[PDB]
């Protein structure tokens, strides 16, 4: 944080820049910060951290899958971009994690070529929900089980 | 003509801290129905280059 | 005094701790029936 | 009906300040170069 | 400055307009086969406008053209999108006036 | 551990669906989320005081 903000302001996440006055140096010399109420939503923070955790690797299985269908079936697909999966998987996810995404993703542009990068990175929260995630899409897998041949 | 997203310049922490834009007097400004004509001129000289 | 757009996507993380996936079954769902075909050997 | 305008996340998506044409564009553009020399005309011999 | 901003790429429909407007060198594929990645969308002429503000001490300035700056270049990959595949019939200008 | 203990703890099946050791790398993997990450530290851990 300190080297990328002395050599170049460009290739990291800038620090966020706070605006003061002048009087108010000398104000802060005088009043010490005493936490007498903690927050009342830190033993939830590790349920919380876990649910949010578990639905952004069901994403990244449903992406895995979705972008092997062009290659698979290109009679249906001729016009299918890879916008088009990113646009099926939101309108399933939940709005919450898609409202978290979202603090910084409408701060900071990200195309296609950033997104598909973060599916393939290898790492997966294992809950509930993924371990079935990843069985429904392997059970699938011969979409005659799913009843549409050609 | 679409106008960029609010939540660019100006990122909200907490209830009475937030960041503050350099170019704050002038977002704020709506524009008059002579700018806004020009701002049209503007448009209708990018389209056609020479 | 945290920002309410903040305080709504936490009070949905709770629910979505609760949303059950699975159910507790005595007997499992059915998945072979047998149509009759007007004989007494052949189904 | 077009792929280009899929707005995915919410980076472009921002608000409608004014509609433009191409009929509207059409006659604004004749408004504008003969209300110059109809300018440049009458403040000068 | 360093862009070629004027390319020759197909015969037309129309045997006098053989060119194709590319504002800042970008292509109107970028909308939807991206290139590149979301940091690294850039050019030369834009570029070397935020290493000196930043030069002069005009750093809050620049953390502001430097965050619109994939939003300017959304805006310019649809005004080629508009010039060389809408705004192309008989009135459009023949290329040897516009090299002149 | 309230739950962990009664007279009938020895004759159960706990169905547990989330694992508590959270991989901090899934949540550091979203593209370009540094300043969501922040907003969602401030709202969650800070506290309050004179």
């Given at each position: ?138 059970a699938a897998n ?9 | ?15 009475r801290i937030t ?32 | ?36 075909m007007q004989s007494?050997?052949?189904? | ?45 | ?100 | ?50």
């Amino acid at each position: 944080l300190l080297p990328d903000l002395i050599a170049g302001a460009h290739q990291n996440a800038d620090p966020v820049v706070l605006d003061v006055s002048w009087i108010s140096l000398w104000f802060a010399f005088n009043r010490s910060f005493e936490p007498t109420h903690r927050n009342e939503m830190l033993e939830v923070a590790p349920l919380i951290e876990s649910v949010y955790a578990s639905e952004l690797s069901v994403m990244k299985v449903d992406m895995r899958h979705l972008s092997l269908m062009q290659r698979r079936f290109p009679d249906v697909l001729i016009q299918a971009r890879p916008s088009h999966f990113w646009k099926a998987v939101l309108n399933d996810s939940p709005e919450a994690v898609k409202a978290v995404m979202n603090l910084s993703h409408s701060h900071n542009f990200i195309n296609i070529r950033d997104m598909m990068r973060w599916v393939m990175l290898p790492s997966l929260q294992p809950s509930l929900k993924l371990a079935l995630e990843e069985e429904a899409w392997a059970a699938a897998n011969d979409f005659e089980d799913l009843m549409l041949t050609d | 003509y679409i106008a960029p997203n609010p939540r660019i310049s100006s990122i909200t922490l907490t209830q009475r801290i937030t960041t503050t834009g350099p170019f704050a007097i002038l977002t704020g400004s709506t524009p008059t129905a002579q700018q806004l004509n020009d701002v049209r001129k503007i448009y209708l000289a990018l389209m056609f280059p020479g | 005094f945290t920002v309410p757009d903040v305080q709504k996507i936490l009070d949905d993380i709770k629910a979505l701790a609760a949303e059950q996936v699975y159910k507790i079954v005595k007997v499992p769902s059915i998945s072979f029936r047998h149509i009759v075909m007007q004989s007494r050997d052949r189904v | 009906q077009r792929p280009e305008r899929i707005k995915t996340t919410p980076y472009l998506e921002g608000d409608v300040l004014s509609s433009d044409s191409g009929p509207l564009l059409s006659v604004f553009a004749l408004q504008e170069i003969m209300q110059k020399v109809r300018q440049v005309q009458a403040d000068y011999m | 400055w360093a862009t070629i901003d004027v390319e020759y790429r197909e015969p037309a429909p129309y045997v006098h307009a053989q060119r194709y407007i590319r504002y800042c060198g970008i292509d109107s594929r970028e909308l939807i086969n991206p290139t590149t990645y979301g940091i690294g969308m850039t050019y030369h002429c834009y570029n070397e406008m935020l290493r000196m503000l930043v030069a002069a001490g005009k750093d809050s300035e620049a953390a502001y053209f430097r965050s619109m700056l994939p939003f300017h270049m959304v805006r310019f990959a649809r005004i080629n999108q508009i010039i060389n595949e809408d705004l192309h019939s008989v009135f459009s200008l023949p290329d040897d006036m516009f090299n002149a | 551990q309230e739950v962990l203990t009664d007279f009938r703890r020895q004759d159960t099946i706990w169905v547990l669906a989330l694992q508590l050791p959270v991989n901090p790398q899934v949540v550091w993997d979203v593209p370009r989320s540094s300043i969501a990450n922040l907003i969602m530290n401030i709202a969650t851990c800070l506290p309050t005081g004179e």
